[PDB]
Design an enzyme around this catalytic site. Sequence first.
Site, PDB file in Angstrom:
ATOM      1  N   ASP A 239       0.810  -1.217   0.000  1.00  0.00           N
ATOM      2  CA  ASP A 239       0.000   0.000   0.000  1.00  0.00           C
ATOM      3  C   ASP A 239       0.847   1.273   0.000  1.00  0.00           C
ATOM      4  O   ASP A 239       1.340   1.699   1.045  1.00  0.00           O
ATOM      5  CB  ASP A 239      -0.913   0.007   1.228  1.00  0.00           C
ATOM      6  CG  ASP A 239      -1.844   1.203   1.254  1.00  0.00           C
ATOM      7  OD1 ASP A 239      -2.018   1.833   0.192  1.00  0.00           O
ATOM      8  OD2 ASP A 239      -2.398   1.510   2.332  1.00  0.00           O
TER       9      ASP A 239
ATOM     10  N   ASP B 164      -1.428   5.584  -5.252  1.00  0.00           N
ATOM     11  CA  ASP B 164      -1.939   4.774  -4.147  1.00  0.00           C
ATOM     12  C   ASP B 164      -2.277   3.352  -4.596  1.00  0.00           C
ATOM     13  O   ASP B 164      -3.380   3.093  -5.082  1.00  0.00           O
ATOM     14  CB  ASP B 164      -3.192   5.445  -3.577  1.00  0.00           C
ATOM     15  CG  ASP B 164      -3.726   4.751  -2.337  1.00  0.00           C
ATOM     16  OD1 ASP B 164      -3.198   3.683  -1.969  1.00  0.00           O
ATOM     17  OD2 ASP B 164      -4.679   5.287  -1.733  1.00  0.00           O
TER      18      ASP B 164
END
Length: 370
Positions: A32, A213
Amino acid sequence: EMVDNLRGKSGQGYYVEMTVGSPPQTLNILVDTGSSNFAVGAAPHPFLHRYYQRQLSSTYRDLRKGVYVPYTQGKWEGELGTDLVSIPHGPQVTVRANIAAITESDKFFIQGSNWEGILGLAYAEIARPDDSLEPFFDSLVKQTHVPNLFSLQLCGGSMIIGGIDHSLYTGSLWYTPIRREWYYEVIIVRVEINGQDLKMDCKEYNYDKSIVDSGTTNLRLPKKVFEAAVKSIKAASSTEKFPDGFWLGEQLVCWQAGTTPWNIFPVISLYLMGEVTQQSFRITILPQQYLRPVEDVATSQDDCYKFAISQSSTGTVMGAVIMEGFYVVFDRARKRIGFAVSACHVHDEFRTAAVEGPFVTLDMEDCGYN
Ligand SMILES: CCNc1cc(C(=O)N[C@@H](Cc2ccccc2)[C@H](O)CNCc2cccc(C(F)(F)F)c2)cc(N2CCCC2=O)c1
């Protein structure tokens, strides 16, 4: 030996194998770039195949401090500590890192995802409880000889730590500055659909901010930009009419297997700020990227998709459907993000996703919202 070290389920993130504790406990960990906490399930959960058992690790140290992280989707709470961590198919180094042991969660773990934790690869500024909690990658660089850079090829996929793998992309790498080290924040200077400018002040594209992201699925856009984008994509695809719920990303659109009308949907170009004044490059996305396939045996006489562009009130998020088919270099050492066409991008016999430039701009306005 690091290539193909990522797996995943579409729409549920990409994960890498790691071990935590002594002796090593194997867990699958979602990668992430949109957060900065390393956290693992540490108690039974209906969706967890396994979890971190701290009592079995002699090297676990309790930090005697709670932690809570609310994402856009999901939230968890847990207890901070440190322990030894390795990455079996990454760099062959072991490091002591901060770990949040998740003891309670809501809508975070996903049924059937095959991962049990999350690896926040962004900067300390957005770590919880605060920026004194050193993120994993910072610990890794401090404690080993690994160069301060990693790259992601999301297809399965590859996370390469410490360097660039040329086998993973074709053509040129184009770089955009990391505007500020908290999220991987970047600046979008122009957006085109079907080659047509959305014609907004470029600050609108980066209100509140724009980030890269890997932990978010969709391309998420600020309200004003999202509404303009949808209007333009509707216009381009007008030969077919879909329910409003589709454009809201709520309901599926289906076509008889094999007959998806790719050609009626436009290409989207995001122009990113270059490393030189008023220069930019673009990354171009095909509908194969922003119409996300939803697998379901029940509907499998058809191919069905969700619209994977959606509205944001917290700025632009360039999520997985933007990153897929690109090789993305997070060059922390030089404070820049590189994009190149991936060896594994999805396209057809007419159009191909691209990363290309340079493009100049006469208007000297800073596109950063601040
Ligand atoms: C892959 C699963 N699909 C998702 C995941 C997320 C999402 O919120 N991902 C998180 C973490 C996460 C990862 C996996 C599972 C659950 C959470 C990411 O860190 C956010 N970055 C930014 C961020 C936001 C808020 C707080 C932080 C903080 F830094 F962690 F605090 C970070 C949004 C999605 N959405 C929502 C609607 C469109 C869309 O695609 C779909």
